[PDB]
Amino acid sequence: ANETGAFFFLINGPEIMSKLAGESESNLRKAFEEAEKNAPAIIFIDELDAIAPKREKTHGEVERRIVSQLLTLMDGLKQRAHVIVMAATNRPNSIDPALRRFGRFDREVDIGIPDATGRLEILQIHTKNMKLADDVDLEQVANETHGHVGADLAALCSEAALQAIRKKMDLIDLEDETIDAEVMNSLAVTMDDFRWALSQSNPSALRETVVEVPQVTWEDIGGLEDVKRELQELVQYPVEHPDKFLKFGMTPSKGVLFYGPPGCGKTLLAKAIANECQANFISIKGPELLTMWFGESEANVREIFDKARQAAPCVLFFDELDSIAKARGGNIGDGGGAADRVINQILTEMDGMSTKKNVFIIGATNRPDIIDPAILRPGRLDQLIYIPLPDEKSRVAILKANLRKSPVAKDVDLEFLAKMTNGFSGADLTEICQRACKLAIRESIESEIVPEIRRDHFEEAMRFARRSVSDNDIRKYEMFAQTLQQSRGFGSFRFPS
Amino acid sequence: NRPNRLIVDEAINEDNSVVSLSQPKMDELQLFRGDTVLLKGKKRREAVCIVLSDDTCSDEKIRMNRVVRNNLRVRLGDVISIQPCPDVKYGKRIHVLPIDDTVEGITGNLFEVYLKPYFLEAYRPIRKGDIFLVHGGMRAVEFKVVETDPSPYCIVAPDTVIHCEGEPIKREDEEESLNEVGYDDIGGCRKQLAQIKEMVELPLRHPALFKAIGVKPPRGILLYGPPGTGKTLIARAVANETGAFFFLINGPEIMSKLAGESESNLRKAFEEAEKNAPAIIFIDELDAIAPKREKTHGEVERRIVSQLLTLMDGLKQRAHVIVMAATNRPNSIDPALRRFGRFDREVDIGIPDATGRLEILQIHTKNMKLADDVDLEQVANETHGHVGADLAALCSEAALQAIRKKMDLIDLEDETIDAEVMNSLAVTMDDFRWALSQSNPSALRETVVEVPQVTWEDIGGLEDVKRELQELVQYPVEHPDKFLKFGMTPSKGVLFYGPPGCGKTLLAKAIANECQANFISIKGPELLTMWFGESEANVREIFDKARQAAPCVLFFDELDSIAKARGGNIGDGGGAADRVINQILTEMDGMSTKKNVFIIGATNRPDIIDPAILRPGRLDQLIYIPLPDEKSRVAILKANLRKSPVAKDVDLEFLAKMTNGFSGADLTEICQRACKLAIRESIESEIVPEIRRDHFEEAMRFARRSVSDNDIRKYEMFAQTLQQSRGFGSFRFPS
Ligand SMILES: Nc1ncnc2c1ncn2[C@@H]1O[C@H](COP(=O)(O)OP(=O)(O)O)[C@@H](O)[C@H]1O
Ligand SMILES: Nc1ncnc2c1ncn2[C@@H]1O[C@H](COP(=O)(O)OP(=O)(O)O)[C@@H](O)[C@H]1O
Ligand SMILES: Nc1ncnc2c1ncn2[C@@H]1O[C@H](COP(=O)(O)OP(=O)(O)O)[C@@H](O)[C@H]1O
């Protein structure tokens, strides 16, 4: 509003209720009237969830009067002059549905927490006024923070400035009325201040939905070339060539569900597919899906699809989809079957969605024998992909992907190390590397009283090699995959004509 | 740049005006140890004090006492200058003249029994116009001389004489009443006050510095803790000693008046503070102001809440003001008040531990002198659930019992009371016992957040796990750069299992003391209280209180205790998850690993824990603690036998080797039974304070064996299955 030559008028949320009843509505009415005279103008409401809590409050005679006054003032906004009404809130469910009718708030926009590439920018956009040192960078400090609101970072910068100036103002002791500018500019900030400020900071949005752009590509996942082509030919073709799908007359697929042994990077391929297609990514993990099975609140699963469809294109990810069945039993469990208050909510919402929208649903699970057949019905989740244990040639790439960040010596051989594992999944290799690089630090610290790993740290690290995927689950998964595949009898046949 | 300035910091000594400096300062200005030093302050006045050498406080600072604080008109966070004065001073006469501001209700001679025992064996220089506090007679009174010999040349010596008149003078507004609360009047909380010291001292002592820069200072600080923790006193002290106006509105003074002007009073409270800049605003009770969670009643309640929100949303730069608020629980505050620019900064105050309650004892009982056999160290150990105000109330009530046992037989019925007998009202051991037994604690069921008092010497043996715990949680903190260089993250939690009764809490408590961090305790019964309560919001802030008091460690006891009430491996139609398992790991999934926090999981049966908890990323470290060996039980028994006297003929090596299926608790119960049976013989022989060998054979009769042979194999097969180091235990790489 300030850079369009239009008048800006701001009423936040409580300045209306602060005054006595009777004139609060008059102030709101005159706020709209004064803006019309200064056309073009704009109206912004900072807080509105405190204005119209018409869901569970049901108290106060003047509250509904103010809500109705606002509704009347905006229903009556004919052409006349040029004005735009802006409103801000915290959650979409904290707004009176009567305000969402056409002509009042028919257009909506959602703003999420920025990712690393966004928090990096918000760093300098606030710290530009202070010069930094030659060894202080904002790229690495923006990576540890993941749950900080955009205002959290600005507050962190301001607080770190105070710590930076405090360590010198005590020994300077410049007690005077006025202050010169020849010394206020030399108040540089160092590494010791951001660490303390970031450790002392208290994040605000830590449990909101994780809607960010991932930072992993196909190079981070080793092997698994069979599924890469299947995922590449399924979700990019309908977007890059929409006309070909419309010409034949059929609709593209809406979701892909895969199963396999736990610890095979079932989240990595779902995250990497978003980066190469230049789209957003959402994360609905198992614990995030068990939080409303007990909460008796089925309204929270309602807007997780709305926030995904608003940020089109996007992809929906579901982790350990059968994790709810473990708390309820399984194949038999209690007197019930394989459905509950949350299974019937997952598919009811995605049944009525438009396939034309640039959205995708990914279902990850470990045991496919517990999932109810209703989910796997043709039309919602028909694509089934089974990921087996990684081969010998794939584990080399898997290990070298994880060993990219840590320094690697020249005598480190990986081909022999990868071929000596048979019943080891993806997580078993990562934990071995973690143990080795942790044990390296112990020798470095003990020798202090070298920044390079050697071959001696390996033999002591493979001692703690764990084998989570036993032999009982391998056959159980193979018999299910073969039963669900069924390509026998007519695998090779030539048509006469 | 006149290299003589010194920063002002609060001292730690509880003596008279004695300053503390560092070791290079002694040779910087050629002073000796026992010399008289002169200090120069503002308002063109001098002072005299004594230098004390210290090497532990800091590298470059001074530690100046409360007397000369107000004597020299110097507040915390200011400049000061010091200089030697090797001049021989021999005082000859002094004028005594108290001020009637605090000398009320006290008659008789208060100059020959009150100031006399305090001046001897002190050798403290005095100056014309000094303000110092002294104790005696269940109260305290300051002193001020208006006309005496011209300073310097005043030293406390027996040859000096005294003379009194008996006409107090009227005080003026030039000085400040020292009877008010200072910074040293708060005890039991050192880490919490240091945060305020670096949060409030800058915007108040340096208004133009913040008015000239673009840094936005905090506009609101929220105070936590159970009622009576001392939230009001902290706010009163941080404002009275900064030269800033203090305005207090508690909680109900707004709702007491008729509707319509309550909002006007709140509005004018903010406006009057702006004129007296710099100023401060403190709200004693706010949970009663904005109960916008479940009340949903009252038309004017939301009006007052919105008025407060509007008044603090509109707080632009203009002048310098800090709004303080206090409450009882973080969940009793309107979330609309927690937005940025209103209460973005929060601080939590917990119940002090033994080392804190000890300090709060003398900080209140300093005004009464004690006996030679009455100590506050032992009496502060039995109390664990007492609020900081509980201890002050206990001291006041114990004073009443101490005076009652003599006032009946004295029977001094008169209008006025002399000070020659009110000072002789000493308190003995019989009064604290009765007062502590009759006292009613307030916070007994709050979260136990204190610093433990156990070290590695209290746990015998178990050297295998000591190195594993030492190389896991101290290395990332002491050497953060090494973990960042490799590019991987340190571990976030360690879960261990084993037979019950092996000190699964002792190693979790001892690891906090050697790392100088706080410790929290979430036991099994504390974890089963919300499985039935149907309230999942209480597990929400137990992590917030732990992360605010960084560094800290989270401890979980008998983690599978919930599964016992629901079954176990099979149980009901469900599996191994419920309304509380899914809340333990969901909150710790999204936490930042960079924070100095740790999670410890203790359990007895590891076959019942759901595999979701043990997933790589949340709790991946598994340690199995077996039964103690023969060489470890000797240390285990001697750790428990440290407090009780031990005879010279007591052999422990043979006593430890004769136990095979005995866990840690089985040895402690044997020692408890033996030392209890010792008291029976001592009492029976009364009609000796040393144990003998006869009390043992009668005590091992009641030896119990809780850990049977069925659980040992069950735990060993699980540990071996979860370890799996066979097949590739010894292999040499070719290259
Ligand atoms: N092809 C692969 N490339 C890179 N990492 C892999 C691959 N397969 C498995 N991993 C590793 O396995 C780990 C487990 O990932 P996760 O998504 O939790 O598996 P799951 O699908 O069982 O959830 C990941 O951290 C990942 O590094
Ligand atoms: N930590 C403490 N240090 C010194 N005195 C204390 C402390 N805690 C309580 N007191 C004493 O007990 C009283 C507790 O009252 P106060 O803390 O002001 O109310 P609240 O506990 O609601 O903040 C104080 O007035 C003070 O005299
Ligand atoms: N190594 C040890 N050193 C000292 N005490 C021990 C040791 N092992 C066990 N104990 C004793 O066992 C008792 C039980 O401790 P506790 O933490 O309750 O065991 P658990 O881990 O089974 O809960 C403690 O009071 C402690 O004195």
Numbering used by the authors:
A (entry chain C): 259 to 707, 728 to 775
B (entry chain B): 21 to 707, 728 to 775
Share the article's original sentences.
The human AAA+ ATPase p97, also known as valosin-containing protein, a potential target for cancer therapeutics, plays a vital role in the clearing of misfolded proteins. p97 dysfunction is also known to play a crucial role in several neurodegenerative disorders, such as MultiSystem Proteinopathy 1 (MSP-1) and Familial Amyotrophic Lateral Sclerosis (ALS). pmcp97 is a member of the classic clade of AAA+ ATPases and is an essential cellular enzyme. p97 is composed of six protomers forming a homo-hexamer with an N-terminal domain (NTD) and two tandem ATPase domains D1 and D2 (1). p97 is an essential protein in regulating cellular homeostasis from membrane fusion, Endoplasmic Reticulum-Associated Degradation, Mitochondrial-Associated Degradation (MAD), Chromatin-Associated Degradation to NF-κB activation (2). Critical functions for p97 include the translocation and restructuring of proteins from large cellular structures such as organelle membranes and extraction of ubiquitinated client proteins to facilitate their degradation through the ubiquitin-proteasome system.
In the p97R191Q, p97R155H, and p97A232E mutants, the primary variation in conformational outcome as compared with p97WT is observed when the D1 and D2 domains are both occupied by ADP. This effect is most readily visible in p97R191Q, with p97R155H and p97A232E displaying similar effects in the D1 domain, but of a smaller magnitude.
